[PDB]
Amino acid sequence: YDIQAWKKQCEELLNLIFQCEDSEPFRQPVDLLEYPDYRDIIDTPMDFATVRETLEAGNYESPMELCKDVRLIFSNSKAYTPSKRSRIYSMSLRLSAFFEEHISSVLSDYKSALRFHKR
Ligand SMILES: COc1cccc2c1CCCC(=O)N2
Secondary structure, X not given: OOOOOHHHHHHHHHHHHHHOHHHHXXXXXXXXXXXXXXXXXXXXXXXXXXXXXXXXXXXXXXXXXXXXXXXXXXXXXXXXXXXOOOHHHHHHXXXXXXXXXXXXXXXXXXXXXXXXXXX
16 A cells, blocks of 8 residues: 555666667657658657656656556557558557556556555
């Protein structure tokens, strides 16, 4: 029932994500010089360095907010891909499966702790 435990859990999950080779395209904001039209398609850019910095700044109140930003990295990849068989998109799908598998207990434990707090 520790309401703050999610933060270190998210830090450790982001560390695992940065070790994953599949996170390479998503570790830093997309380079507009490499993808000139990216901002015509993507309204809200997101990347794992921005997620980590937001977390470390104390600018996430809950793991749901972090999860929303991580899911935005994956939905941006899907929206920008020219093909469902593209390399970067294919990496995003494996990374998303790994993220979802690991964030599930973080979210469940936080929501349970908060329900206990408000009992
Ligand atoms: C954070 O990096 C993202 C985010 C959304 C979409 C993509 C990428 C990587 C490079 C550009 C790309 O092909 N797709």
